[PDB]
Structure formats: C-alpha cells, structure tokens
Amino acid sequence: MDYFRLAEKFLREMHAKYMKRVSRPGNTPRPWFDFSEERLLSRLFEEMDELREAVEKEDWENLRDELLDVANFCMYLWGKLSVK
C-alpha cells in the first residue's frame, strides 16, 4: 500500500470507531464542535493513557482499537484548534 490507500482504510476504521462511540446513549455526535479545547485535550490524554496501558499489557488485539481512538481525538482537537 501507498500512503493514500492506507489512509483510506484507516479513515474507514476511524469512522467505524466514531460510530460505535456516538451510538452510546448521551454521547455527542460532534465532539470536535461540542466540547471545549480543554475537554478535548483532556479526552485525548485519557485515550493516549489507554493506548499506553494496552501496550503495557501486551494487549495487541485491543491495541488496534486504541490507535483508532487516539487518531480520532487527535483529529477532533486539530479540528477545534483549526477553527479557533
């Protein structure tokens, strides 16, 4: 795969992860718009800590999911800062 094909595959997975999260009762479908910069930072650090935990437990199956979570929250905070 070149970058573009990898990125297309990864975006589809990121989106599927977003779907699952927003499907939980009470969850905002637009965290990048609805949350403050501070809350988005806070959330991203939580996700990064979860990724570190998965690495420490050598939980590679869950590692894939945690990489998606981190990528999405990087995107959401980037989005918030890019309007700001």
Residues that bind its own copies (CB under 8 A): 1-16, 18-19, 22, 29-30, 32-33, 41, 45, 48, 52, 55, 60, 63-64, 67-68, 70-71, 74-79, 81-83
- Least distance in Å: CB of 68 to Mg ion? 8
| Distance, CA of 22 to CA of 36 (rounded, Å) | 17
Tokens of 14: 């990121």
The tokens for 69 are 């979570």
What string marks each residue from 8 to 47 as x (binds Mg ion by CB under 5 A) or -? ---------------------------------------x
Residue 28 burial (10 A CB sphere; 0-12, 13-18, 19+): exposed
